[PDB]
Design an enzyme around this catalytic site. Sequence first.
Site, PDB file in Angstrom:
ATOM      1  CG  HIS A  91      -0.543   0.140   2.484  1.00 54.12           C
ATOM      2  ND1 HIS A  91      -0.823  -0.811   3.451  1.00 54.12           N
ATOM      3  CD2 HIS A  91       0.251   1.094   3.021  1.00 54.12           C
ATOM      4  CE1 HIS A  91      -0.222  -0.381   4.552  1.00 54.12           C
ATOM      5  NE2 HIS A  91       0.438   0.762   4.336  1.00 54.12           N
TER       6      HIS A  91
ATOM      7  N   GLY B 116       2.280   6.325   9.840  1.00 58.66           N
ATOM      8  CA  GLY B 116       3.674   6.170   9.433  1.00 58.66           C
ATOM      9  C   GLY B 116       4.350   4.919   9.957  1.00 58.66           C
TER      10      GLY B 116
ATOM     11  CB  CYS C 113       2.586   0.801   7.289  1.00 60.12           C
ATOM     12  SG  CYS C 113       0.890   1.073   7.838  1.00 60.12           S
TER      13      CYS C 113
HETATM   14  C1  LIG Z   1      -6.593   5.015   4.251  1.00 62.85           C
HETATM   15  O1  LIG Z   1      -5.424   4.239   4.513  1.00 62.85           O
HETATM   16  C2  LIG Z   1      -5.561   2.884   4.634  1.00 62.85           C
HETATM   17  C3  LIG Z   1      -6.720   2.172   4.368  1.00 62.85           C
HETATM   18  C4  LIG Z   1      -6.708   0.791   4.483  1.00 62.85           C
HETATM   19  C5  LIG Z   1      -5.562   0.125   4.872  1.00 62.85           C
HETATM   20  C6  LIG Z   1      -4.401   0.831   5.155  1.00 62.85           C
HETATM   21  C7  LIG Z   1      -4.394   2.220   5.034  1.00 62.85           C
HETATM   22  N1  LIG Z   1      -3.282   2.983   5.281  1.00 62.85           N
HETATM   23  C8  LIG Z   1      -2.138   2.508   6.033  1.00 62.85           C
HETATM   24  C9  LIG Z   1      -2.385   2.221   7.526  1.00 62.85           C
HETATM   25  N2  LIG Z   1      -1.409   3.268   7.842  1.00 62.85           N
HETATM   26  C10 LIG Z   1      -0.957   3.945   8.902  1.00 62.85           C
HETATM   27  O2  LIG Z   1      -0.101   4.813   8.795  1.00 62.85           O
HETATM   28  C11 LIG Z   1      -1.548   3.647  10.221  1.00 62.85           C
HETATM   29  C12 LIG Z   1      -1.342   2.429  10.785  1.00 62.85           C
HETATM   30  C13 LIG Z   1      -1.900   2.048  12.039  1.00 62.85           C
HETATM   31  O3  LIG Z   1      -1.786   0.921  12.527  1.00 62.85           O
HETATM   32  N3  LIG Z   1      -2.640   3.008  12.682  1.00 62.85           N
HETATM   33  C14 LIG Z   1      -2.883   4.279  12.175  1.00 62.85           C
HETATM   34  C15 LIG Z   1      -3.628   5.205  12.905  1.00 62.85           C
HETATM   35  C16 LIG Z   1      -3.854   6.465  12.380  1.00 62.85           C
HETATM   36  C17 LIG Z   1      -3.376   6.803  11.132  1.00 62.85           C
HETATM   37  C18 LIG Z   1      -2.638   5.895  10.392  1.00 62.85           C
HETATM   38  C19 LIG Z   1      -2.362   4.634  10.916  1.00 62.85           C
HETATM   39  C20 LIG Z   1      -1.108   3.579   6.442  1.00 62.85           C
END
Ligand SMILES: COc1ccccc1NC1CN(C(=O)c2cc(=O)[nH]c3ccccc23)C1
Lengths: 302, 302
Positions: free
Chosen positions: A41, A143, A145
Amino acid sequence: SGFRKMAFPSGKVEGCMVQVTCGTTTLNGLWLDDVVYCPRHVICTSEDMLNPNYEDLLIRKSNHNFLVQAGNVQLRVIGHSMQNCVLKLKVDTANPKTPKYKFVRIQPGQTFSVLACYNGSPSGVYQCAMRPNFTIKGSFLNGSCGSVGFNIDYDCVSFCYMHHMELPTGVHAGTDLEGNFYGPFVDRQTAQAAGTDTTITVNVLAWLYAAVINGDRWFLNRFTTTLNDFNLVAMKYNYEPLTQDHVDILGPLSAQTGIAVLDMCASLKELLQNGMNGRTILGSALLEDEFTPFDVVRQCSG
Amino acid sequence: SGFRKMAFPSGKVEGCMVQVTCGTTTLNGLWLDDVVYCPRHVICTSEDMLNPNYEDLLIRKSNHNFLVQAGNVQLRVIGHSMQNCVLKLKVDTANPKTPKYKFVRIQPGQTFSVLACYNGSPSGVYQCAMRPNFTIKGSFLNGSCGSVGFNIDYDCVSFCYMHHMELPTGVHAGTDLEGNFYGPFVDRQTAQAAGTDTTITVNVLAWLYAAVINGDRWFLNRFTTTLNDFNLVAMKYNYEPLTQDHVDILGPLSAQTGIAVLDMCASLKELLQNGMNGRTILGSALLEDEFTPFDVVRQCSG
Ligand SMILES: COc1ccccc1NC1CN(C(=O)c2cc(=O)[nH]c3ccccc23)C1
Ligand SMILES: COc1ccccc1NC1CN(C(=O)c2cc(=O)[nH]c3ccccc23)C1
Ligand SMILES: COc1ccccc1NC1CN(C(=O)c2cc(=O)[nH]c3ccccc23)C1
Ligand SMILES: COc1ccccc1NC1CN(C(=O)c2cc(=O)[nH]c3ccccc23)C1
């Protein structure tokens, strides 16, 4: 003595963390030999996540679109490929800090250490379990991931988890290092149910044995039970059924404390039915299930 | 999201751990520049610990009696001296892995990461607090002495603790890196009282703010209180009195959540008087006090 949620020393894994950027998206990568592994992703915009076609999105990307930075130095990307939900970015330099390593797909109920990273820089380390419902209760922000989970066996790092996403319940989902998600999760923005978060019974019993080794013995009673009787109570509390294989696994702890596994089950049955009555076990007021019998033995013997 | 007891990445400290042996006693040392720091009780036999005269015992030791091993390589000891309860073994080689470092004497209520070591080899990392009674609730077995506590500020390691002993309550005592014990403890085999283990109120409030940031809001009520009224209840539960300096420290968390510090105190007052009613906050059934307001902000923002 003492019993803490202990993680492996993270040094070997810190040397593997890099930053991967694709477009406006930055996350972490794991650099081992001449390959950088990261969540696929990284190629997505926020809009793409609603219904991503990873094959189509990846075709618009070339090697020079993946910016890989190890500390302050840029690595040259000479190849890229997608394997399930991870990307493998081939770089022109092998990581000089690559430890002895394996990629393992961990079983539910087993534990591992997570090195939480942001922008390719390690920020913290903590221990967690792969829950029976294939989620982890981690601590991950925007951030994070590409942060990985691992175990260490002397000098060999067994990587078992790469972080991909957070589910509605506040729990986390990710893949093994082959890019296969643990559980039914998919890397798309759709509400995904983890299912019942069942308690790892064998781990609760291991932790009760740790408490006994540590002098906390108030919860021990004069009773015993059978596997079938205990499991009738375990079912009611969404505990995993205890099997003879679990009893065999608890053998060493049962013998060290002189408390038969079924006698400890009787104590756990009473704790489930009557509660803690305001008392604590190893500084906790609930039954802890994220320590395996190996973790307890390792922490109580060395 | 998510909230875990997170430790700093241990890599920088792993590179400093060595094994120190004197006679039949082996423990850990911290090698920084050309000095190895270790507990002075490395010179003692089990019998000596009942009433040790460290000055007299140390006179019977020469440089060649201190065996210092860094991995599989032996270091040459060219000097030794005692500073309070630590020995400083000057070696002929500066540790090539010496990070940027400081020695700090941590305040009670502050947290740090411990890298538990045995035979100079790191085994695990965990987070803990210097309790108001100057003990830590660690996880230390035979051979763990010389394991250190530290914090990291970007690239600089602030060493604050060296492990020396375990007290009757199962808690641990040690020194700063100048060899001064935290608290009234002495390196002798005499039963030593730690005193009342009071709860770090400002840390409990910080952790309640972390819970709110993480969506756990059940314990919030429609009440407020004053510092003096809250402290009347805090005294009863052996909680540290909350001061205006603590309120100021909780300022950023109070504003992030929109919950005034005194409103959160009213919630904590109700939790103390009525209990959790079988409910949990951040996966805990008791009020957690080993996260500072800095730790909560760091874990909730990055
Ligand atoms: C819309 O994005 C997705 C949709 C489905 C799947 C993945 C994404 N993105 C990915 C997930 N990300 C993060 O950085 C993240 C990971 C986390 O565990 N917790 C968070 C809490 C708050 C903001 C971000 C995160 C990037
Ligand atoms: C909370 O999860 C969902 C809810 C509804 C629908 C989908 C999801 N799952 C996916 C997995 N995502 C994240 O990792 C994620 C991405 C992000 O940009 N911001 C977040 C803020 C908070 C929690 C998670 C995220 C979205
Ligand atoms: C009689 O020895 C002392 C008396 C007073 C003071 C110190 C010692 N010795 C020191 C303490 N040591 C340990 O290795 C240790 C440290 C620990 O925290 N917990 C333990 C549990 C079980 C066995 C040993 C330990 C060495
Ligand atoms: C439990 O502490 C005491 C009790 C009575 C008297 C003195 C102490 N304090 C000192 C600090 N010690 C230890 O660190 C220690 C040394 C050891 O060889 N074995 C142990 C086993 C269990 C717990 C502690 C130790 C002895």
